[PDB]
Amino acid sequence: SDKLELLLDIPLKVTVELGRTRMTLKRVLEMIHGSIIELDKLTGEPVDILVNGKLIARGEVVVIDENFGVRITEIVSPKERLELLNE
Amino acid sequence: LLDIPLKVTVELGRTRMTLKRVLEMIHGSIIELDKLTGEPVDILVNGKLIARGEVVVIDENFGVRITEIVSPKERLELLNE
Numbered sequence: 001s002d003k004l005e006l007l008l009d010i011p012l013k014v015t016v017e018l019g020r021t022r023m024t025l026k027r028v029l030e031m032i033h034g035s036i037i038e039l040d041k042l043t044g045e046p047v048d049i050l051v052n053g054k055l056i057a058r059g060e061v062v063v064i065d066e067n068f069g070v071r072i073t074e075i076v077s078p079k080e081r082l083e084l085l086n087e
Numbered sequence: 088l089l090d091i092p093l094k095v096t097v098e099l100g101r102t103r104m105t106l107k108r109v110l111e112m113i114h115g116s117i118i119e120l121d122k123l124t125g126e127p128v129d130i131l132v133n134g135k136l137i138a139r140g141e142v143v144v145i146d147e148n149f150g151v152r153i154t155e156i157v158s159p160k161e162r163l164e165l166l167n168e
Contacts, residue, residue: 008105014101034153047099068100081109
């Protein structure tokens with residue numbers, strides 16, 4: 001808590017994922033322009049929001065000025081965000 | 088080597104923010120990312136950016152159609168870094 005005060009300005013890396021899959025090296029080498037990669041995410045599901053590699057939230061894609069963004073639709077508690085980042 | 092499974096991730100974008108901000112976010116908060124709206128999305132294999140493309144739907148799953156990709160030689164180089 002006094003500990004927390006010292007951490008508030010630490011920059012954290014945020015990544016937003018549309019989905020994941022797995023493929024062989026062979027398939028990676030054979031892919032071409034136009035190749036289609038199917039992901040583990042279903043229509044109707046939100047995108048994932050990771051902070052230093054930990055899933056803390058999910059959301060929906062929005063346009064902000066010229067950039068993609070995400071509006072948070074699901075998130076863990078602030079205490080759980082700390083716990084996960086402290087793993 | 089050809090049969091080794093690799094992890095593929097498709098990213099909409101990235102940003103950086105402080106821990107304070109991360110802890111203040113709530114339902115409805117907006118996070119702006121580093122990708123511009125006309126750009127294709129990133130395709131990473133084992134964390135290495137090898138391709139970019141456009142999002143598609145295949146039946147009920149999301150997918151990506153590749154629009155930019157490095158050479159097969161360069162794919163192998165990156166995966167062997």
